[PDB]
Copies of this chain bind each other. A is one copy, B any other.
């Protein structure tokens, strides 16, 4: 059983993962994903969510007063507050495994430059807060990162070292290229060693950092 709340100024962005849920998953109370428009918590007629950064420099910083109200209403002391940001700790498969057993995730989607730091600092005094990066690149908003995180976590919720080498399926011959004959050999010990070497070679070529 897991509840995910997403707070964003683009709630429509999250509508695909809402419907991506199996009907037998949400009916069983194993998962409910709710999306909230951040502007619900704005204070002015202009529904402002950002303001200029202290200490200058082009870019806009999201307002702490608005975010604080939103989190005040949505978060509980049991909440795991996830803040996607390119300045975050790495979000990896180990993280997804860890978060897969959480009762309540709140994902705060920020917009470039970021969210006033006091929001996270304040929240962290009564809940667990995790600023995380899904990758070394910059997005205009956290929304796509939320999709990634939601998918990587939920697929580890039951019912909701090296790189892997190439995979093949039918036909055995296609556009002049044959499936590696070892895979059709019925020698499963040999297949395993073949696959291990394929993985070692691909990892060396693509991710030497992993060795």
Q: How far is the CB of A177 from chain B (nearest CB, A)?
A: 5
Asked if A116 and B16 sit within 8 Å, CB to CB, the answer is no
Interface of A is mostly: mixed
Does A29 make an interface contact (CB < 8 A)?
no
Q: When the two chains form their complex, are residues A202 and B87 in contact, meaning their CB atoms are under 8 A apart?
A: yes
Please give the distance in Å from A21's CB to the nearest CB on chain B.
Answer: 12
* A93, CB-defined interface residue at 8 Å: yes
- Residue interface bits A120-159, CB-to-B below 8 A is 1, else 0: 0110000000010011111111011101100110010000
Q: Are B88 and A206 in contact (CB under 8 A)?
A: yes
Sort chain A's interface into a size bin. 35 or more
Residues in B whose Cβ lies below 8 Å from that of A184: 54-55
Once the chains are docked, how many angstroms separate the CA of A138 from the CA of B137? 18
Complex contact B116–A168 (CB within 8 A): yes
Is the C-beta of A41 less than 8 angstroms from some C-beta in chain B?
no
Taking a contact as CB atoms under 8 Å apart, the answer to whether B137 and A169 are in contact is no
Specify the chain B residue showing the minimal Cβ separation from A156: B138
CB distance from A183 to the nearest CB of B (A): 3
Fill in one digit per residue for A22-63: 1 if any B CB lies within 8 Å of its CB, else 0. Answer: 011000000000000000000000000011111111011111
Query: Which B residues lie within 8 Å of A148 (CB)?
Result: 134-135, 137, 139, 144-145, 148
A54–B168 CB distance below 8 A = yes
Q: Which of the segments A7-15, A73-81, A101-109 contacts the partner chain?
A: A7-15
Which positions in A face B, CB cutoff 8 Å? Answer: 10, 12-16, 19-20, 23-24, 50-57, 59-65, 68, 86-93, 95-96, 113-118, 121-122, 131, 134-141, 143-145, 147-148, 151-152, 155, 163-172, 174-175, 177, 179-180, 182-184, 188, 191, 195, 202, 206-207
8 closest residue pairs by CB, A with B: A117-B166, A55-B183, A61-B169, A135-B135, A54-B183, A51-B169, A87-B163, A137-B152
